[PDB]
Scaffold this active site. Structure first.
Site, mmCIF file in Angstrom:
data_model
loop_
_atom_site.group_PDB
_atom_site.id
_atom_site.type_symbol
_atom_site.label_atom_id
_atom_site.label_comp_id
_atom_site.label_asym_id
_atom_site.label_seq_id
_atom_site.Cartn_x
_atom_site.Cartn_y
_atom_site.Cartn_z
ATOM 1 N N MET A 23 0.823 -1.199 0.000
ATOM 2 C CA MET A 23 0.000 0.000 0.000
ATOM 3 C C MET A 23 0.864 1.258 0.000
ATOM 4 O O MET A 23 0.433 2.315 -0.464
ATOM 5 C CB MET A 23 -0.958 0.007 1.196
ATOM 6 C CG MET A 23 -2.065 -1.069 1.139
ATOM 7 S SD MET A 23 -2.959 -1.156 -0.453
ATOM 8 C CE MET A 23 -3.898 0.352 -0.374
ATOM 9 N N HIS A 55 2.538 -6.001 -4.721
ATOM 10 C CA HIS A 55 2.097 -7.394 -4.736
ATOM 11 C C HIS A 55 0.609 -7.473 -4.472
ATOM 12 O O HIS A 55 0.034 -6.539 -3.949
ATOM 13 C CB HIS A 55 2.866 -8.238 -3.698
ATOM 14 C CG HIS A 55 2.605 -7.862 -2.270
ATOM 15 N ND1 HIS A 55 3.292 -8.432 -1.219
ATOM 16 C CD2 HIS A 55 1.755 -6.962 -1.719
ATOM 17 C CE1 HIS A 55 2.883 -7.896 -0.085
ATOM 18 N NE2 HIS A 55 1.950 -7.002 -0.360
#
Ligand SMILES: CSCC[C@H](NC=O)C(=O)O
Ligand SMILES: CSCC[C@H](NC=O)C(=O)O
Ligand SMILES: CSCC[C@H](NC=O)C(=O)O
Ligand SMILES: CSCC[C@H](NC=O)C(=O)O
Ligand SMILES: CSCC[C@H](NC=O)C(=O)O
Ligand SMILES: CSCC[C@H](NC=O)C(=O)O
Ligand SMILES: CSCC[C@H](NC=O)C(=O)O
Lengths: 187, 196, 184, 183, 183, 184, 194
Positions: B89, B113
């Site tokens: 994030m 990811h």
């Protein structure tokens, strides 16, 4: 990562603009803080809108109902704003804002579901507990039915299990009125 | 313990300079603090640029999305700076800065990811949690595709496993715009950048 | 824990003199405080030197690199001072001071070694993580080679295992410039 | 809970009197505070003496050597006072006071000994750690030798095992100069 | 939590009246704080008597001796008061008050006993540690002897095991001078 | 957290009214504060009465005796008030208030009993500890006898086991003087 | 995490408006704070009403009785307000407000039940503890009977097991007087009630 000041304190600054933040799991401590602020804001003016920024995964039912009742009780119009997520009791508070004043950022997520809990002791006690959580469930169902304008039949079916919703789905369902639109990027 | 003082609070001081720090694991409390600061800065000026210093290993998805939406919702240009690392994030927020204003120091590292999570309960509940986690994956994938201008195919292929990137590789990917060596040096108008 | 107040606090007092203290394990939390101070000082003046007192056993790599990059980025001359010890990432920061401005008290010690970490999950994930730590290793080697002026070969050989150095050895190695001498 | 507010605080007040306190185990945080105070006092005046009250069981070696170097680096005369005890690194600091200015109260106790540590891992690593702790030992020994004026041989013998000393015994060994009862 | 503030903090205001509180277990932290206060009160006035209120179960020997030596070092007269209890090192501080100025309230309790501790390691180290605590024992015994005027045989016998005393029994023993009900 | 601030801390505010709160388990820390506050109020005035509000399950004997001796030491008349409960050492403090000024709210509950404790070690040490607690037991019995005006025989019989009392039974017993639902 | 500082601490700000918050589990600690605040508000004015906001699952019996007696001791009238829940000792404090000034919001929940606890030791000690908790039980039954105007038999029967009540059922029972929907709305002199 213990807290800005400017100027008081960043949160106290938002309160100055009649903004109350409901963040993290809801419990009596949070309910107590939020209710204290709402009552304070109504005291400063019982007519000016009050803003409630919401990012919560849910929490204690009664604690959530305490905030809910306070929101409905004060005379002030109440704008709710979904940031990140409004799950469980969090979505009830979001849906509880004044009609036409319930908003959500485009990437937040909403979630509703029947309450959960526990019961232990003699059969007699179990029975009493099961009856109480059942009254609690029907109570919550009526509240959602009231603010979403959906029928009990729809609420009951939708909350049997965890029901996740996008801002748009939530708007359609009746939990919020406006899905905010991001302005154009400056590039 | 830790924090200085200058003339609040070292952090409060940089805030007066429209500098917002996103450091450490991202969660609801972090998001709340960052969001309250951005709104406060827009209030002071919806024009003056806002600087977001990022050194984070990532954190809670919804908390990250709360910061992302706030970044995209306020009018201010936002300059993001990757220092140390912007993983998960953290890299989404980095890439979410105003186009042309996404920076990184030369030795930071970037990582992206797919999301991770856990499910537990009856089969019905597990199916519901899986469906939701897959929606988050697609949502995050569209967000990365938008800011990096890469195709979903590229995004899906790059995020199936942990994907680490140097600042220059991140620049090429579309996560960043500039890798700085120095701010404007004596006599120079523009900062000195790492050349490809 | 830490603190006398002064005339704020003792550490804030040093900050007034453009001194930034890097004490203890280095992690994102310490890097953020240090960087905030570095940036603050540069805004005060991007020309005046800045002093970094260092007594650290090391810490998180990316966190160390964050401080390292900030030290290089700002325009200010950076004077580094080893007090007690500068081990691992601590010695990288010591060596990253402006050439000719890296110091050490005579009884401090320096230590360098390759990075350490963990890898877990499926073989594919483990491979991805191994690849990443090897990049960090090389990256750290190049940084040390640059500031010490030693060849990569020399750096590689010297950091394969914990390598302790006295101030004099560190000076010779190129990690620092001046070994301070006590007055009479 | 614990610290008095004065005319802030009780310790800050003593700092105004050029009094620095070295209490409890010595670690990196304690060294940093102590060092910052020392440098501060020097800038205030590089001539006026500085008083270091020591009551410590010892602590981390590099942290102790940090205080030591700082004590030797500044120009100020440093008056050390042993209160309660000055054990291990605490005793090295006591002995590092300016010659003729190392003191002790009547019932304090001093203790010196070689360094201790640990190490685990591959043999190659254990060897590396052993070599390093060996260097620390010799390093400390030479410093005790310097400030006590005892031969290296005498230091090596005296520190092989825990060696406790009364204030008078520490005086004779060269760790301090005066044992005071009253002012 | 605790702490009422005044007219600073409740304890800080008591210091204004030259009252130093020795509360709870005595350790390096408590000793340093108490010493600072004692020193502080000496500055402002080197003649005005200092009042030390004591309610403690005891603590670290060296920490207590650090306080004891400071009490003897400063010139200020010192009135010690036993409140609740003065056991172990706490009873030593009580007895160390200026002759004629050692007090106790009617229902306090005093307690004395030899020191305790632990020895560990190779036989050589155990003997070294045993020798050291035996020295601390004799050192403490000599201090009690001095202030109580009891013979060493009396002290050794009274301290081999825990010895509890009523205020009056403590006065008789020589630990204190007065047992006051009212001011 | 659990703090209110006026006009400062709610307790500091009450102290301005010469009100001392004895709350929770009684230990050396609680006693130090209480005694400090008492000594403070006596200095502010040795004639003005002091009000001690007591809500405590009891605590350490020596700690309670410290507060007890201070109460009898200062010259100020002390009004004691049992709120919630005054158990064990707490009830001793309640009964130690100035004769005629020992109060209690209607539903508070009082409790008295002999001291309890532990002991481990050699038989000789156990004997010493046993001898000591029995002494503490007699000492407390005499104190209760003194303020309640009951004979030792009565006290010994009443405190052999936990003895709960309503405010009125406590008044009848001599532990307090008035039970107040509203102010006189 | 902590508390926003208006204009200081939100609770202090409300305390300035004669508002006392009884939130969370009741224990000696919470009881002390509440009682201290109540006494403070009396000093300010032993005539001006006092508001007690209640949202509690209950707590220590003696702690709750300390608050109860204080409420009855102070001269000023006390308005009790239930939000969220007023369970066990919490519902006792709610019912203990000045007659006609005990309120609740529409969705609060009330609950009453006999006390619980534990006993341990020699049979003689168990008996003593058993006798004490039974006295406590009757003491509480008397307090409820007095404030709800219900007979001791009704109380005993209703509290044997946990008894939950809606605000309107609680009003009927005598635990509270009004269930509010809104305070006096625009143009209205009185609040709107269920
Ligand atoms: C609408 S039921 C809300 C209760 C809450 N749910 C899960 O987060 C618990 O916790
Ligand atoms: C595709 S981003 C998924 C969220 C992210 N992952 C774990 O570190 C956190 O942060
Ligand atoms: C190659 S340096 C790796 C980071 C370092 N390692 C542990 O001591 C810390 O500091
Ligand atoms: C040779 S001194 C080594 C430092 C010392 N070690 C254990 O007591 C401490 O202090
Ligand atoms: C001879 S006194 C030894 C110190 C004392 N002993 C344990 O309680 C404490 O205090
Ligand atoms: C004779 S009162 C002894 C003190 C008391 N003991 C056990 O409850 C406490 O409370
Ligand atoms: C009759 S009130 C008994 C005390 C109460 N019981 C548990 O909920 C508490 O809370």
């Amino acid at each position: 990562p213990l807290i800005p000041i400017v100027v008081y304190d960043i949160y106290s600054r938002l309160l100055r603009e009649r903004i109350v933040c409901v963040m993290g799991p809801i419990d009596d401590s949070v309910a107590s803080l939020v209710i204290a602020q709402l009552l304070f804001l109504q005291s400063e003016s019982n007519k000016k809108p009050i803003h409630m920024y919401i990012n919560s995964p849910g929490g204690v039912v009664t604690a959530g109902l305490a905030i809910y009742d306070t929101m409905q009780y004060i005379l002030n119009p109440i704008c709710t704003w979904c940031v990140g997520q409004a799950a469980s009791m969090g979505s009830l508070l979001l849906a509880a804002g004044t009609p036409g004043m319930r908003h959500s950022l485009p990437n937040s997520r909403i979630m509703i579901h029947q309450p959960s809990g526990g019961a232990r002791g003699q059969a007699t006690d179990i029975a009493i507990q099961a009856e109480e959580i059942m009254k609690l469930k029907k109570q919550l169902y009526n509240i959602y039915a009231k603010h979403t304008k959906q029928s009990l039949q729809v609420i009951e079916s939708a909350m049997e299990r965890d029901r996740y919703m996008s801002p748009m789905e939530a708007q359609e369902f009746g939990i919020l009125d406006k899905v905010l639109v991001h302005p154009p990027q400056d590039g």
